[PDB]
Design a protein around this nucleic acid. Structure first.
Ligand code: MG
Lengths: 143, 178, 154, 99, 221
RNA sequence: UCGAAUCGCCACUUCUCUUAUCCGGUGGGCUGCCCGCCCGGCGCCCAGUACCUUCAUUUUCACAAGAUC
RNA sequence: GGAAUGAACCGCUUAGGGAUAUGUGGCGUCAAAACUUGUGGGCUCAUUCUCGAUACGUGAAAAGGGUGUUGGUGGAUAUCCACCGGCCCCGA
RNA sequence: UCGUGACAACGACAAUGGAAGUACCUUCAUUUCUCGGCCAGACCCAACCUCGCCGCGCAAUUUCCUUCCGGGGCUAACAUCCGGUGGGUACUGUGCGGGUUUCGAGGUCAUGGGGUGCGUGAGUGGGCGGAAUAAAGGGUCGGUGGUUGUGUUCUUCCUCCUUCCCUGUCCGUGCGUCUCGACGCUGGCGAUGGAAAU
C-alpha cells in the first residue's frame, strides 16, 4: 500500500504509462502525437515530449484528461528523464539551459525508438496528425 | 423461449378433516404465463367440478413440465371459447410447431385474430403430437412432402441497428445523412 | 424468379441476430416462416429455430434429408468442402474485411492509410504518360485544339 | 404536452443513432458559438490580442442520454442556452477523456 | 437572389467570386407521399437545406379514382362570403408536396416559417440542379419496401392532371431532352473512366511490396 | 467601412431502369438443380513509404490565436 | 398532469426550489419519446357528407341481406347439403 | 391629456401578462488592484448513485436423453408417431450473491470540506495507525450410531472422527461551559483607469 502523502502515490489511468504514444486533444498542439515521459512528483500532470524533429512538440506539461493514450508503446529503459523537475516549469526566445535539456532527452528518445524493431514505421507514425473527417465515429474505434 | 404460456402441472386436494378424511388428489394441466395464474385456473376448475373452494384446499405441486426435443411436429389442439349470442363453441385445430407450449400459444393468438377471443374466455381441453397421414388440414399437410422447396419473394431487408442510415446516395451506399 | 430456394441442405447467412453474419445449413422446415439451422463445424451454431426474415439463402447446397443427424451433416459438409468455397467468395471477404477494420488499433489504421496513399500516388503517375500519348483528359484534349488553332495565326 | 422546461437541452449528434453510442459522450464538454456586435472582453484578452472579436461561446456538459436513438441531455453551466440557438450548430468536444 | 449593386460592389472590394451553401438534393421518384413528407419536415426543423426534384413521380396508395375523388372533396371547400380569402387549391405536383410538408410544421411561428423557407420542390430535374452533385433517396419511403406488389397505386402527376394542372406535356418534353443529353455525356468519358480503372490496376506491381500486402489484408486489393 | 456564426471536394459522384428481379452482364444440360463465357475516387502533414527535414517561452482547457466566403 | 376542446371522467390532491423514479396517457410529423423497435402471429380494400382508428360520449344507428374474403360445426361421396363466427359491403 | 428633440424598434397573431436567456444601454450598489468576496480547469477525502465482469442454492435440469427390437409411415431408406429392451448421469423454472492479507471501472454545474494545513476547527475507519500470521467458520471424501418417510431392505437429517480445499485475526486516540466565523493547486482577468468583476 502507498500512502497519499508519499510522493510515489498517484491516481492515473493504467493506459497512461511512460513510453505510451498519446494524441493531444486540446491546445495549440491539438491533433499531434507525443511520447509520455513521466509524471510529476505529486499527483500532478504528466510530462509529454514528442521528438521535436518528428512532431514538433517540445517538453511541456499536460493533464491526463486532455490526451488519448493509444495501445502502442516504446521502451524507455535506456532513457533517464531524471532532469525533468517541477521548478523548470515553475519559471514563468528560449533559454539555452532549456535547449540543452530538450536536445539531450530528444536524442535518447530517438535512439530508443530506432531500437524498436518497427522504428521506421514508428517515426512516420509520430509525424501524422489526427482529425475528425465528415462521416466518422470516434466512439466505435479501439485505439 | 419465444412462446409465452408455459406448461404447468398443478396437483392439489381438499384439506383433510372429519366427515371426509383422506380426500382424493387431483392433477391438472394448464398453460399460463406464470405460476400465480396457473394456481388461479386450478382452483376455478376445482370449484366448478368437485365443489371444492380454494379456502378449504391446498396445493401440493406447481411443477413445470419438460418437452422432448427440437424437431418439427404436428399438434392437434381441441379448444373452446365462450361468447354471448353463441354460448360455448368447441373446435379442433392443427398447427406446426416444435413444442406443446408453442402450439398452444399459437392457438391463443389464432383465436384472437380470427374470432376476437381473450385469454380468460378460452379453455384448452387437450394437446397431442399426431403423426403424418392422419392430419386433416391441407394448410398443414402441404409441408409434409420431402424435397419441399420455395423461394423468398417480396422481402423487406432492414439493416442492423448500428448502420441505419436516413439519406443514402442513389447509386451507392454512401450514407449522406446519418 | 432467380431466387435461391429454401430447402433442406441450403446454406444461409444470418442477418441481425446475436449470431450475425454466421453461416449454417437448413435441416428442416416448420410452417411458412421458421426453419431449423445448424452448423457442426463452428463454435456455437447448434440446432436452433430461426425466422425466415433473418436469413439470406446462398448459392451452395448440400445433399441431405430433412431431420438428419449431426454426424451425418458433418460428414456431408466435409465431403463437398462447401465451407471453404464460401470463404473464397467475394461476399465473405468483404464481411471479413469490415470486421478487421472494427478491431484496428490506430496503428494499423495508420498503416492502411499509408498503403492507400502509395497506391493513389502511383495511379496518378500511371495515368500520366498515358495522357501525353493518346490524350484522354480534359486539359490534354484541349491542348491539341489550342495548338492547331494557333498554327495558322502563328 | 404541458410546455417546455428550459434548464435542460436536447442535442442530436452525427453518427450515434444508439443509446450505447450516446453513453460514450457522457461528461464531455459542449459549446455554442455565436457573434455579438462589438468587441467585449475575452479569455487571454491581454496575452493574445489576436483573439479579440465579436465571437462568443456558451459552454455546457453532457449529463445523460435521452431516449433510445442517441440524443443526449445537456446542462449549460448555471444559466440556460438562448432560444435563438434552436436548429443551429453545437460543438461536442472529446475531453475530458476516459480512453 | 438578384444581387443589387450594393452586393456586387461589396464582393468586388472583398475579392469574392462564388459561394454555395450545403444543400441535399433528393430524387423523389417512387416515394410514398406521406412518409417522405414526414421525414423531410423533421430534417427541416433540424437546420437542413433540402431541394427535391421529380415531384411528379410521387406515389399514393389506392386507385386513381379513389384519390381523384379525395382531391375533389378538398376543392369543394371555400369561404362562401368571399372565395378570394378562402383556402387555396394549388394544382401542380410540386405545390402539393409543399402543402403536405407545411401541414407537418408549426406554420404560425417564425421558427416554422423559416423552416418552410428552406425547401424548393422542383418538378423534373432543372438545368441549374443537374450538375450540382449526386442525388439521394430515402429508403424508409421507397414504395418497394412499403407497398405490397398486388395493391394499386397512384402516380402524383397523373392525378394532378385531370384536376387542373396543365404542364404535364411540358415536363415530359423537357425530361426526355435531359435524358438524351445526360446519356450522351455519360457514354463520353468512358475512356477516362476505363483509363483510371486501368491505372489503379498496374499501380500494384509498382508499389512497394509491403503496402500491397496491407491492402490485401483489408480486402481493398 | 466589415470585428463577425458556418469548417469536404472532384471534368472518376454529378445518366437511365428494375425489386416476382441472372444486382455486372450472359449461354447450355437434365420444372429445380448442375455446367460454362466476357468485362464512387481522392483527401487526414516528405507529391509518397524512403534516407532527409523548422516547429518551443502561446512553458496544463478556453471560438482554430488558423482557413473558406 | 391526461382524454385535441369540457365544473363533475382518468391519475393525483397542492410551503419555495434541485436530482431521481413513476401514475393516467403515449413513442410518423405537428409534439418529448421505438432517428417508422421485434431476429412476433393473423385479418381487412372501403367510388362522391369520401374504410378504420382514445372509454364516460345515444360526441350516432336497427330489423333484414352479400361465396367479397378468412375460420368452425354436423351429415352423404371419394365433391355436395345445412348451420354458426371474424373483418369488409348494402340497408344509411 | 398634449407639443417638441433624441433614441428603440416593430409586419399582419388586439395589446397587457408569466417563466427563462440573450443583444444593446445604464448620473445605481458592492468588491478588487499584488494581493482578490472575480472567471474557469483538474486533483483529494467522505457520502450517495450507476456500469462491467464472475458466481451460488433448489429433483429446475427424467412427462426427458441414448441404443436394440416389433408396429406404422414415406421413399431404397431415414424421419414425424405408438408399444417394449438394456443403458443414463446453451437447455423455456424459482430464491439469491461478489473489494480491504483486497474483484475492474464511471458520475455528482445533483452534496459537505480546514480541502491535514494553527491553537477546543473532535479523520472512529474491514478503509487511518500499531501488532500478529488460518486465529474460527465453511465446502467435499471415507467411515460412525441416533432420527423422518415409502416399500416389504433404502431415503433423508443429525453427532463423532478422518482426508484434502477455501477465507482473514487482535488493540487504540472526549475538550480548559456553548455557538458562529477560517473556502487548498493551476491558469485567465485586475498594477487607480471614462479600469476589471458581481
Ligand atoms: Mg420527436
Amino acid at each position: 500500500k502507498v500512502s497519499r502523502k508519499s510522493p510515489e502515490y498517484s491516481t492515473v489511468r493504467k493506459s497512461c504509462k511512460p513510453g505510451t504514444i498519446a494524441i493531444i486533444l486540446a491546445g495549440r498542439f491539438r491533433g499531434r502525437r507525443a511520447v509520455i515521459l513521466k509524471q510529476l512528483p505529486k499527483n500532478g500532470p504528466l510530462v509529454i515530449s514528442g521528438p521535436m524533429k518528428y512532431s514538433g512538440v517540445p517538453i511541456r506539461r499536460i493533464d491526463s484528461r486532455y490526451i488519448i493514450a493509444t495501445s502502442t508503446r516504446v521502451d524507455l529503459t535506456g532513457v533517464d528523464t531524471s532532469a525533468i523537475t517541477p521548478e523548470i516549469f515553475k519559471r514563468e526566445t528560449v533559454s539555452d539551459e532549456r535547449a540543452q535539456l530538450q536536445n539531450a532527452i530528444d536524442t535518447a528518445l530517438i535512439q530508443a525508438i530506432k531500437k524498436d524493431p518497427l522504428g521506421k514505421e514508428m517515426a512516420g507514425y509520430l509525424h501524422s496528425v489526427f482529425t475528425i473527417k465528415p462521416g466518422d465515429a470516434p466512439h466505435r474505434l479501439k485505439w | 423461449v419465444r412462446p409465452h404460456l408455459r406448461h404447468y402441472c398443478v396437483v392439489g386436494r381438499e384439506t383433510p378433516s372429519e366427515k371426509n378424511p383422506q380426500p382424493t388428489v387431483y392433477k391438472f394441466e394448464v398453460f399460463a404465463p406464470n405460476f400465480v395464474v396457473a394456481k388461479s385456473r386450478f382452483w376455478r376448475m376445482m370449484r366448478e367440478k368437485n365443489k371444492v373452494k380454494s379456502t378449504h384446499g391446498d396445493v401440493l405441486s406447481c411443477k413445470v413440465v419438460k418437452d422432448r426435443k427440437l424437431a418439427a411436429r404436428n399438434y392437434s389442439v381441441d379448444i373452446a371459447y365462450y361468447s354471448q349470442r353463441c354460448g360455448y363453441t368447441h373446435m379442433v385445430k392443427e398447427f406446426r410447431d416444435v413444442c406443446k407450449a408453442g402450439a398452444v400459444s399459437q392457438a391463443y393468438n389464432d383465436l384472437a385474430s380470427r374470432h376476437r377471443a381473450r385469454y380468460h374466455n378460452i379453455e384448452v381441453l387437450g394437446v397431442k403430437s399426431i403423426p403424418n397421414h392422419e392430419v386433416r388440414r391441407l394448410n398443414v399437410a402441404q409441408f409434409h412432402p420431402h424435397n419441399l422447396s420455395f423461394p423468398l419473394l417480396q422481402r423487406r431487408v432492414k439493416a442492423p441497428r448500428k448502420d441505419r442510415v436516413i439519406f443514402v446516395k442513389k447509386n451507392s451506399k454512401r450514407a449522406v445523412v446519418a | 424468379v432467380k431466387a435461391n430456394y429454401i430447402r433442406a441442405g441450403r446454406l444461409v447467412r444470418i442477418l441481425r441476430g446475436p449470431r450475425q453474419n454466421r453461416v449454417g445449413v437448413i435441416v428442416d422446415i416448420v410452417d411458412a416462416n421458421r426453419v431449423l439451422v445448424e452448423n457442426p463445424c463452428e463454435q456455437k451454431m447448434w440446432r436452433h429455430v430461426q425466422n425466415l426474415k433473418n436469413v439470406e439463402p446462398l448459392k451452395f447446397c448440400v445433399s441431405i434429408s430433412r431431420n438428419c443427424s449431426t454426424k451425418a451433416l458433418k460428414e456431408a459438409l466435409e465431403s463437398k468442402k462447401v465451407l471453404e468455397k464460401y470463404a473464397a467468395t467475394k461476399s465473405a471477404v468483404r464481411i471479413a474485411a469490415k470486421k478487421a477494420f472494427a478491431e484496428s488499433t490506430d496503428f494499423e489504421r495508420y498503416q492502411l492509410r499509408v498503403a492507400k496513399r502509395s497506391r493513389a500516388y502511383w495511379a496518378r503517375k500511371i495515368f500520366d504518360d498515358n495522357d501525353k500519348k493518346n490524350p484522354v483528359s480534359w486539359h490534354k484534349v484541349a491542348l491539341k485544339k489550342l495548338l492547331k488553332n494557333a498554327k495558322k495565326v502563328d | 404536452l404541458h410546455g417546455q422546461n428550459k434548464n435542460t437541452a436536447l442535442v442530436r449528434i452525427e453518427n450515434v443513432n444508439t443509446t450505447e453510442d450516446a453513453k460514450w459522450y457522457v461528461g464531455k464538454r459542449v459549446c455554442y458559438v455565436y457573434h455579438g456586435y462589438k468587441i467585449k472582453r475575452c479569455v487571454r484578452w491581454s496575452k493574445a490580442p489576436a483573439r479579440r472579436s465579436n465571437t462568443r461561446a456558451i459552454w455546457g456538459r453532457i449529463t445523460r442520454p435521452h431516449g433510445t436513438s442517441g440524443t443526449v441531455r445537456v446542462k449549460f453551466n448555471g444559466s440556460s442556452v438562448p432560444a435563438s440557438a434552436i436548429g443551429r450548430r453545437i460543438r461536442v468536444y472529446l475531453y475530458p477523456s476516459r480512453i | 437572389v438578384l444581387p443589387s449593386r450594393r452586393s456586387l460592389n461589396r464582393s468586388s472590394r472583398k475579392g469574392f467570386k462564388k459561394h454555395r451553401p450545403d444543400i441535399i438534393v433528393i430524387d423523389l421518384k417512387d416515394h410514398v407521399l406521406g412518409r417522405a413528407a414526414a421525414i423531410v419536415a423533421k430534417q427541416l426543423l433540424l437546420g437542413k437545406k433540402i431541394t427535391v426534384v421529380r415531384c411528379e413521380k410521387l406515389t399514393i396508395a389506392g386507385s386513381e379514382i379513389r384519390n381523384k375523388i379525395k382531391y375533389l372533396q378538398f376543392l369543394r371547400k371555400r369561404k362562401l362570403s368571399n372565395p378570394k380569402l378562402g383556402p387555396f387549391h394549388h394544382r401542380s405536383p410540386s405545390d402539393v408536396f409543399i402543402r403536405t410538408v407545411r401541414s407537418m410544421l408549426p406554420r404560425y411561428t417564425k421558427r416554422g416559417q423559416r423552416a418552410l423557407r428552406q425547401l424548393v420542390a422542383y418538378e423534373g430535374v432543372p438545368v441549374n440542379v443537374v450538375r450540382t452533385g449526386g442525388r439521394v433517396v430515402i429508403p424508409k419511403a421507397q414504395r418497394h419496401n412499403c407497398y405490397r406488389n398486388e395493391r394499386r397505386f397512384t402516380v402524383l402527376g397523373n392525378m394532378c392532371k385531370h384536376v387542373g394542372w396543365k404542364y404535364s406535356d411540358v415536363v415530359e418534353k423537357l425530361e426526355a431532352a435531359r435524358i438524351e443529353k445526360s446519356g450522351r455525356h455519360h457514354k463520353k468519358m468512358e475512356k477516362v473512366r476505363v483509363a483510371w480503372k486501368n491505372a489503379r490496376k498496374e499501380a500494384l506491381k509498382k508499389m512497394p511490396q509491403k503496402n500491397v500486402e496491407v491492402l490485401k489484408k483489408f480486402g481493398l486489393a
